[PDB]
Design a protein around this ligand. Structure first.
Ligand SMILES: *C(=O)c1ccc(O)cc1
Length: 305
């Protein structure tokens, strides 16, 4: 399945790939973003990484602004959701749905030695491919997993209260109003220019300073949340490496090194959470160092691209 850089972008891109909808994948693969929300940090919601969620509104703006592609949110009800689903499958073949990940658990945490897989009501995305009498078929494109789910579990998952709001059978419809094609260099220039002008590297520094202040926080789950949140940043870095390879782009020479720096930050957050270490000072230092490295990298991308 199409990885994207977050659950929402993975779902849009998987839909786009299966239905050869032009430009959606390229606009996702060329995204360059960082956010930090101190209020979400202290409510242990998804507080950093590529984009606020679960819907990536900045990506929606990019799709409209560059390709004249709209993403329309539909809201439904218990009585109407499945019949509306059948009509969507007849007309478009797929439906992108908001789902409580509590009912999906698409990722094998035991592969990374985490056996205490704490259950959480978190909104995620699935691509619905088939409606049966007592079951549906879904793809979780972010975790490259597909399953048959009972009709009961499907309906429950689409109607549950999560830590990040109330799901009411929400579905996302991508429609092109007249697609403008972009060169990958144009899409990257706009993103890197926006990254610098909005001082997104500054939000990395803020994250670093907040990590330093958790020295004596007895609660460590911010570090697991941070670990999960930063997978989006690793994916954007890998996506840009893949774009560099495909289109023979000129990049500053330290792109792989930056990906490695984010992978190390993630490793140390995971080790801290798992009581492997006691090193918030070290983690905060690495975050503040990568903030400056990312600012410098972005300035150099605008020069050499
Ligand atoms: C994507 O939306 C998503 C949600 C929740 C988890 O845990 C992982 C991925």
């Amino acid at each position: 399945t199409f990885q994207g850089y977050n659950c929402y972008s993975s779902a849009l891109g998987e839909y786009a790939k299966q239905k050869n909808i032009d430009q959606v994948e390229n606009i996702i693969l060329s995204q360059w973003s960082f956010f930090f929300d101190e209020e979400q940090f202290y409510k242990n919601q998804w507080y950093t990484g590529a984009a606020d969620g679960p819907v990536d509104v900045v990506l929606n703006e990019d799709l409209r602004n560059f390709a004249n592609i709209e993403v329309l949110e539909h809201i439904s009800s218990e009585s109407q959701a499945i019949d509306e689903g059948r009509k969507v499958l007849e007309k478009h073949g797929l439906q992108i749905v908001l789902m409580d990940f509590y009912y999906m658990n698409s990722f094998n945490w035991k592969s990374l030695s985490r056996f205490n897989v704490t259950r959480e009501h978190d909104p995620a995305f699935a691509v619905l491919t088939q409606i049966n009498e007592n079951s549906v078929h879904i793809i979780d494109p972010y975790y490259h997993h597909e399953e048959n789910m009972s009709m009961e579990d499907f309906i429950k998952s689409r109607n549950s209260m999560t830590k990040q709001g109330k799901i009411s059978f929400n579905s996302y419809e991508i429609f092109s109003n007249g697609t403008k094609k972009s060169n990958i260099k144009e899409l990257l220039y706009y993103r890197f220019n926006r990254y610098l002008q909005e001082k997104m590297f500054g939000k990395i520094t803020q994250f670093g300073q907040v990590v330093k202040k958790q020295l004596d926080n007895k609660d460590r789950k911010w570090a697991f949340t941070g670990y999960n949140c930063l997978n989006s940043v690793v994916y954007q870095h890998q996506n840009l490496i893949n774009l560099q390879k495909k289109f023979s782009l000129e990049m500053p020479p330290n792109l792989q090194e930056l990906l490695d720096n984010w992978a190390l930050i993630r490793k140390k957050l995971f080790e801290y959470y798992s009581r492997g270490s006691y090193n918030t000072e070290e983690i905060s230092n690495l975050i503040c160092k990568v903030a400056s490295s990312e600012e410098q990298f972005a300035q150099e991308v605008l020069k050499v691209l």
